[model samples]
Target: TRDQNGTWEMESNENFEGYMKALDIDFATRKIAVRLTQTLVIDQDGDNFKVKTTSTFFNYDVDFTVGVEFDEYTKSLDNRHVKALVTWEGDVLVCVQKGEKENRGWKKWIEGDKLYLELTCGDQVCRQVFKKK
Candidate 1:
């Protein structure tokens, strides 16, 4: 089990609309996501975990055990769904989403006193940084 202590908040988010565009997210959805605020919550139990994203616009949740396959829907960004799996690459958590897009999903890790996340969709990539509060 990873460090199951403390709650981490989304301090900042940078998203590339290129991937959304590739998925035909529409102009309206892209605009909404650009201005929306996303908060992520993680609950870890042994090798299993649950992550929830809450926002004023929409909410998303995921529950999976390491190396196990699960279904994920990117409803807010696009109506696309995919089969995803998350595994630990050293101490970093990496997620691979297999679907319409060639390369997609995110990677997360803790560095020093801060948390870092990188999201990818097609050729577009977004990096976000968070500080523990």
Candidate 2:
């Protein structure tokens, strides 16, 4: 929903190590990444959105409109290039990423004041919960 605009602090992160492993991230980075708390800053205006995922070490920002396909470069995350399409599946925001990795995408939704995010890559799914702060 457009109510998702705000800075959300990470309340919980689960299976992040496995998700990073599935992305073939370096061992050192995975070790550090799993320990860091990620924050999401979302800005929504009409059907367009700018979502920023940030941690202590790296950040990835994306700007796109719903149902529009755009080239996505996961520079600080997995350092890969892909075409990404984001759309609304009911009340949830779903992204389908087409790239070398299979079953890669993410789903985001808001419940009350909490934001739930599920990041998928290969067979690993990392679930993260955030609260607007």
Candidate 3:
């Protein structure tokens, strides 16, 4: 849904540290990352989507077309490369990443004025809520 296309400011996140650890993110980086409030800018054109995650410490941008699998590298985060595919389940946008890490992916959906994101890697899940800006 285009309802998810907007600037979103982070409200809160749960289990982010554990999620980072699951991605093999270093302890020092995780400590610094957990202190920052993130912003998500979502844009869509036809079936193409771009999600930009911005924070004081770092930024990550991913662009993909629904149903199309492409190479993705988490260069700004854990530095792992993967094959990524994005799809929609009803109104929720879901991404699946195939890589060394098992069950790595994320989901995004809008509820009222709040945007919800769930990031997963291995057994760790980080849930984040964001307010529409």
TM-score of each: 0.83, 0.95, 0.95
Model 1 per-residue lDDT at 73: 76
Q: Write the per-residue lDDT of candidate 1 for residues 1-133, one digit (tens) a residue.
A: 2453345666777764665576677898777776666677778887788877777886778788989988987766676789999988988889999998877888888887667888787888887776665
Model 2 Cα lDDT, one tens digit per residue, 16-109: 9999999999999889989998899999987899889899987878899998999988887788999999998888999999999999999999
Once superposed on the true structure, which residue ranges of model 3 sit more than 4 Å away at CA?
Answer: none
Model 1 earns a TM-score of 0.83
Deviation in angstroms for 101 in model 3? 0.8
Error of 3 at 57 (Å): 1.3
- Candidate 3, 1-133: lDDT as tens digits: 5468889999999999999999989999999999899999989887888889999988898888999999987887888889998888999988999999998999988888999999999999999999988
Task: State each model's CA lDDT, in order.
Answer: 0.76, 0.91, 0.91
Weakest ten-residue segment in model 2 by summed lDDT: 1-10
Which pairs in model 1 have colliding backbones? Answer: none
**How accurate locally is residue 52 in candidate 2, as Cα lDDT from 0 to 100?**
91
Error of 3 at 2 (Å): 5.2
